[PDB]
Amino acid sequence: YNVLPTTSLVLGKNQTLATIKAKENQLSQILAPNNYYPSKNLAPIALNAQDDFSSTPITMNYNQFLELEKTKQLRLDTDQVYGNIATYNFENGRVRVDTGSNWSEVLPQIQETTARIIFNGKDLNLVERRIAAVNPSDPLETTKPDMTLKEALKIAFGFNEPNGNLQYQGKDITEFDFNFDQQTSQNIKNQLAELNATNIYTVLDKIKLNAKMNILIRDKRFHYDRNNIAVGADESVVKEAHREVINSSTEGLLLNIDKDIRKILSGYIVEIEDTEGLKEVINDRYDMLNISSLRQDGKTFIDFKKYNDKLPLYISNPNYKVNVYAVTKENTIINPSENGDTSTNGIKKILIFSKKGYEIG
Amino acid sequence: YNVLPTTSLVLGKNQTLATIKAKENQLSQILAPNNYYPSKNLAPIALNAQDDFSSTPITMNYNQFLELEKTKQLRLDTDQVYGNIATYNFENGRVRVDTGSNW
Amino acid sequence: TQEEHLKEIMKHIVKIEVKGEEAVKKEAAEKLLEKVPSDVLEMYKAIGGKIYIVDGDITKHISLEALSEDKKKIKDIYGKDALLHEHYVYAKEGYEPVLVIQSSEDYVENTEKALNVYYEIGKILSRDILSKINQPYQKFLDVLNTIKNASDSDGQDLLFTNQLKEHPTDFSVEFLEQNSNEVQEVFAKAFAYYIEPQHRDVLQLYAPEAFNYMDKFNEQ
Amino acid sequence: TVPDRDNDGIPDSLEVEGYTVDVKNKRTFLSPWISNIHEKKGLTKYKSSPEKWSTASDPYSDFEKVTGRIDKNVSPEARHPLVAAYPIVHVDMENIIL
Amino acid sequence: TVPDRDNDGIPDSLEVEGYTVDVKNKRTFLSPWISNIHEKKGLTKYKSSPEKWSTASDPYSDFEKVTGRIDKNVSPEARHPLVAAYPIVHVDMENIIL
Amino acid sequence: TVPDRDNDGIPDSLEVEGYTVDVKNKRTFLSPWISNIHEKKGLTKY
Ligand SMILES: [Ca+2]
Ligand SMILES: [Ca+2]
Ligand SMILES: [Ca+2]
Ligand SMILES: [Ca+2]
Ligand SMILES: [Ca+2]
């Protein structure tokens, strides 16, 4: 409550233009979790002031102005956030804001006493949970009940053992991989050395957790970048999600593509193969890949017409092959090559769709 | 907690340009030990004001401007740092800031 | 302060030792009888009275078998119909009077439940303890008149049935003879409201005279 | 007088040995854990610190978190005492105007 | 009534002669020092002033520092009462803009 | 002493089982719900 972030306008590598605390025009009274201020239908708010009474605009000199209009690199950092707690009153039930206390008092207390677990199996989104675990060198911290890893995963992420096997939704835990920083990985190494076990997946009910641990749990299917975003799968997985064709037309394709899967695909490639074999690509540019639209019925819709000058495909002979290929984010390009290459030539395409011309319409 | 350093812009040997107390744009709520404000991945903060309501830029005259563009010697001193203690409460366990007391 | 409120709400909320279902059921019934003055309880066992706290349907009992299915159609203290096998108290008119109740948690919760049990006890007094030496009986006969002819029909909408209200004439000093049934149901009603602590002021309210009598009656 | 060193309205042996909250008619009752009854109802066994008013050190007691006398914007998976409840706020920038 | 002149919740003879803090089940107990038991557990013998509420004069009591009822951002080596706990802040300058 | 855990000046069994507010002469009285009287007056069970 009473959210006032402290942010920073930065040019270049680390050339900070300005550091601005949010003023009373920029106050957010409520920021409930999984929400935006302002709401997503409304337009974002405007920050343009430096004074405490908001009477001075944010100033830029000449050289920074030239560098900004050349490089267009203007980044924004979130340094710290002011905000209060409202507490319950046993008197009348009314939850009231203490303006004195803030989360600044509380967040390092939470960080130094808990284990942190980040998990992205719910729609490839990094979900962070901190769970209280024992620091042995702190006598007050040892007064907590012990936390195994499996119990923590059960209570924190809604996991279950419906058949004695730990599961997130209908997926097994064994399809997820574990990642640890060096201290936590060392401690897990020591605990597995003491338990004389090799597979961690067998001993999840015995893993004693401690304070300040860090546990990253990802899907084994997808490939991840530096920032641990899902970037791309193997070919076996991408094909498996496209085995459901709904509408075949020369205007587009309607498929029931899995919501998780589609989020790692940048775009699509549409070509036509001869009966002897040619490679004539309709959308033959690096920036002609975005055709995949998502209808509100839960079915992803492909469209040939968007990059064919408002016209459907051209079937010169109904015995050809109409190929539609997809591009992962790890394989996509965002600029032409060295010399001039604005084509789909050097792209790691994946076979999703290959049907004849008399089987479409 | 509530870190407000008092710093000083100095030219030359000991030619002090200005002495500035950190204002509310420059407040640091938490500075835990072995840490930076802001964090090392983020860019450092900008100090450019003299007023208590941050409405006057930090001014330099002509001769100091010439000497700065000749010598490029502009040093920064940390004179004193304002900041508070948060103490434990035996009532509810909550560690609370006394704004009255300081280090 | 906030902790004092916390101590209030927890003393209400937190329990530690479990009496168990059978003990709680019995204890709850006992607590009801503690509101009843032992003045009438001793007079009940004096005339050969037994108190039972059974479970399930009351009709399924040893001391009460299938006696006369007509009386298994009952009205509550509100006068709304009820099937006895779904109820939780019944008093027996016979040469060996005996009262039997169901056992429930709700006898420390449902004041409505308690109110009908004090109602049936009110019957027990009004006939099985009062019908003997009722006469001259004028002591209660006069206060019942005041409820009839007065402003605010509330008191007679509280205690009288749908018959004594609509009887146009004032109450004759023969009606108690012909209808010792109806005049003792009223006494059973006003008893239960008086005994039940929360409906007590309600009796002082809507029927001040019936309270004024039943207040005097017990304590002296 | 039963002890509660953490002063959070809930005694120490219950926080150690396991407990639960159960409504009976319209009233919340703080029972200690019994596996014959509460396990059949699906009630979750709770353990917390006998000396921490807030075992997760968040600004909410153990008792408020198990009772429900809390800010309801707290997520339901954060209603367990060993689960911390805290905001994570970061700002995105949609547009520049120079 | 045992004396504690320093009023820090811990008596004077224990601060003089040595003491320790030990959990037993889930509860911290302030024992005086016994070498037969606490030395085998690896517990550190503690001595502090009987007349200083904070023997290191930092704004934290002796009892808070040995108990753990403290700001947890205090370094663990500063959790000893004879070790002071204080910030050291200095500002660096990365860049000029004229 | 009748309990009111919610401390709102009205006891707990009445809030559970039904109640009403009724004036008699010029004075508001917090009655528990009785269907013989308050229903005929048109009072709303709470
Ligand atoms: Ca407790
Ligand atoms: Ca506790
Ligand atoms: Ca002492
Ligand atoms: Ca001392
Ligand atoms: Ca109430």
Swiss-Prot record, chain B:
Relate the outcome reported for changing residue 25 to C.
Answer: Loss of capability to undergo conformational changes that lead to pore formation and translocation
Q: What gene name is listed for this protein?
A: pagA
Q: What is the lineage of its organism?
A: Bacteria, Bacillati, Bacillota, Bacilli, Bacillales
The name on file for this protein is: Protective antigen PA-63
Q: What is the effect of changing residue 48 to C?
A: Loss of capability to undergo conformational changes that lead to pore formation and translocation
| Effect noted on mutating residue 51 to A/K | Loss of capability to undergo conformational changes that lead to pore formation and translocation
Q: Where is this site: Alpha-clamp?
A: 90
How does the protein associate with the membrane? Multi-pass membrane protein
Positions bearing the site annotation: Phi-clamp: 53
Q: What does this protein do?
A: Mature form that oligomerizes and forms a pore to translocate the enzymatic toxin components edema factor (EF) and lethal factor (LF) into the host cytosol. Following attachment to host cell receptors and cleavage by FURIN, homooligomerizes to form ring-shaped oligomers that are in a pre-pore conformation, and associates with EF and LF. Toxin-leaded complexes are then endocytosed in a clathrin-dependent process, followed by a conformational change of oligomerized PA-63 from the pre-pore to pore state, which is triggered by the low pH in the endosome.
Where would you find this protein in the cell? Host cell membrane; Host endosome membrane
Q: Fill in the domain comment.
A: Phe-53 residue forms the phi-clamp in the pore and catalyzes protein translocation via a charge-state-dependent Brownian ratchet. To pass through this hydrophobic restriction, substrate proteins LF and EF need to be unfolded prior to translocation. The alpha-clamp consists in an amphipathic cleft between two adjacent PA protomers, which assists the unfolding of substrate proteins LF and EF. The alpha-clamp binds non-specifically to alpha-helices of substrate proteins LF and EF.
From Swiss-Prot, chain C:
GO MF: metalloendopeptidase activity; metallopeptidase activity; toxin activity; zinc ion binding
The transmembrane residues are none
The Gene Ontology CC terms held by the record are: extracellular region; host cell cytosol
Inducers of expression: Positively transcriptionally regulated by AtxA, which, in turn, is induced by bicarbonate and high temperatures (37 degrees Celsius).
Q: Where in the cell is it found?
A: Secreted; Host cytoplasm, Host cytosol
Answer whether the UniProt record assigns the keyword Secreted to this protein. yes
Note the effect listed for residue 13 to A: Does not affect translocation into host cytoplasm
The Gene Ontology biological process annotation of the record reads:
proteolysis
Describe the effect of residue 6 to A.
Answer: Does not affect translocation into host cytoplasm
**UniProt effect for mutating residue 118 to A:** Loss of ability to bind to PA
Q: Does the keyword Signal apply?
A: yes
* Keyword terms of this UniProt record: Host cytoplasm, Hydrolase, Metal-binding, Metalloprotease, Plasmid, Protease, Repeat, Secreted, Signal, Toxin, Virulence, Zinc
Give the residue ranges for region: I.
Answer: 1-220
Q: What are the ATLF-like domain coordinates in residue numbering?
A: 7-219
Q: What does this protein do?
A: Lethal factor (LF), which constitutes one of the three proteins composing the anthrax toxin, is able to trigger rapid cell death in macrophages. Acts as a protease that cleaves the N-terminal of most dual specificity mitogen-activated protein kinase kinases (MAPKKs or MAP2Ks) (except for MAP2K5): cleavage invariably occurs within the N-terminal proline-rich region preceding the kinase domain, thus disrupting a sequence involved in directing specific protein-protein interactions necessary for the assembly of signaling complexes.
What remark about domains does the record contain? Answer: Lethal factor (LF) is composed of four domains: domain I contains the first ATLF domain that binds the membrane-translocating component protective antigen (PA); domains II, III and IV together create a long deep groove that holds the 16-residue N-terminal tail of MAPKK before cleavage. Domain IV contains the catalytic center.
Membership in a protein family: Belongs to the peptidase M34 family.
Q: What is this protein called?
A: Lethal factor
The record lists the organism as Bacillus anthracis
Curated annotation (Swiss-Prot), chain F:
Binding of Ca(2+) 2: at which residues?
6, 8, 15
Substitution effect: residue 11 to A: Decrease in the ability to bind to LF and partially toxic at high concentrations
Write out the ranges of the annotated region (Alpha-clamp): 29-37
| UniProt: Ca(2+) 1 binding residues | 4, 6, 8, 10, 15
The entry's stated outcome for residue 14 to A is: Decrease in the ability to bind to LF and partially toxic at high concentrations
Q: Mutating residue 32 to A: what's the consequence?
A: Loss of ability to bind to LF and completely non-toxic
What compartments host this protein?
Answer: Host cell membrane; Host endosome membrane
Consequence when changing residue 32 to S: Does not affect significantly interaction with LF
| Bilayer topology annotation | Multi-pass membrane protein
Where does the source fall among the domains of life?
Bacteria
Site Alpha-clamp: list residues.
5, 14
Q: What is the effect of changing residue 38 to A?
A: Abolished interaction with LF
Protein task:
Mature form that oligomerizes and forms a pore to translocate the enzymatic toxin components edema factor (EF) and lethal factor (LF) into the host cytosol. Following attachment to host cell receptors and cleavage by FURIN, homooligomerizes to form ring-shaped oligomers that are in a pre-pore conformation, and associates with EF and LF. Toxin-leaded complexes are then endocytosed in a clathrin-dependent process, followed by a conformational change of oligomerized PA-63 from the pre-pore to pore state, which is triggered by the low pH in the endosome.
Domain-level remarks: To pass through this hydrophobic restriction, substrate proteins LF and EF need to be unfolded prior to translocation. The alpha-clamp consists in an amphipathic cleft between two adjacent PA protomers, which assists the unfolding of substrate proteins LF and EF. The alpha-clamp binds non-specifically to alpha-helices of substrate proteins LF and EF.
Protein name as annotated: Protective antigen PA-63
Annotated source species: Bacillus anthracis
In terms of the whole protein, what range is present? 203 to 248 of 764
